Design a protein around this ligand. Structure first.
Ligand SMILES: CC(C)=CC(=O)N[C@H]1CC(=O)NC1=O
Ligand SMILES: [Zn+2]
Length: 104
């Protein structure tokens, strides 16, 4: 079972790659613009384009800096890559409702 970009079908991640950060792969969070995201943490993802330099500002995950992750194919905002932390150093937080799940 794999996750594709809902807008264009780009291959992004797999159910096998889910990561229970702080005990749960799912985290419901809001940014400073008041947008709610249901974020699923993954150890790995592909097919993204990470934009800009990392920032710790308003990070939802203690110890991690984030970079915006777009679908590399269509440019849809799919979530964030997190880095600079520990155990693990890096991971992806993807917006669940921007993905489509289906057969490998
Ligand atoms: C431009 C956007 C859409 C930024 C954003 O929402 N950043 C998240 C990432 C994070 O961990 N905390 C935030 O506020
Ligand atoms: Zn896409």
């Amino acid at each position: 079972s794999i996750f594709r970009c809902r807008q264009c079908g780009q291959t992004i991640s797999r159910r096998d790659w889910l990561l229970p950060m702080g005990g749960d792969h799912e985290h419901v969070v809001f940014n400073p613009a008041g947008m709610i995201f249901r974020v699923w943490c993954f150890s790995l993802a592909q097919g993204l384009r990470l934009i800009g330099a990392p920032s710790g500002e308003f990070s939802w995950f203690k110890g991690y800096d984030w970079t915006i992750a777009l679908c590399g194919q269509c440019g849809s905002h799919l979530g964030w890559h997190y880095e600079g932390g520990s155990q693990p150093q890096t991971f992806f937080g993807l917006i669940k409702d921007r993905l489509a799940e289906g057969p490998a």
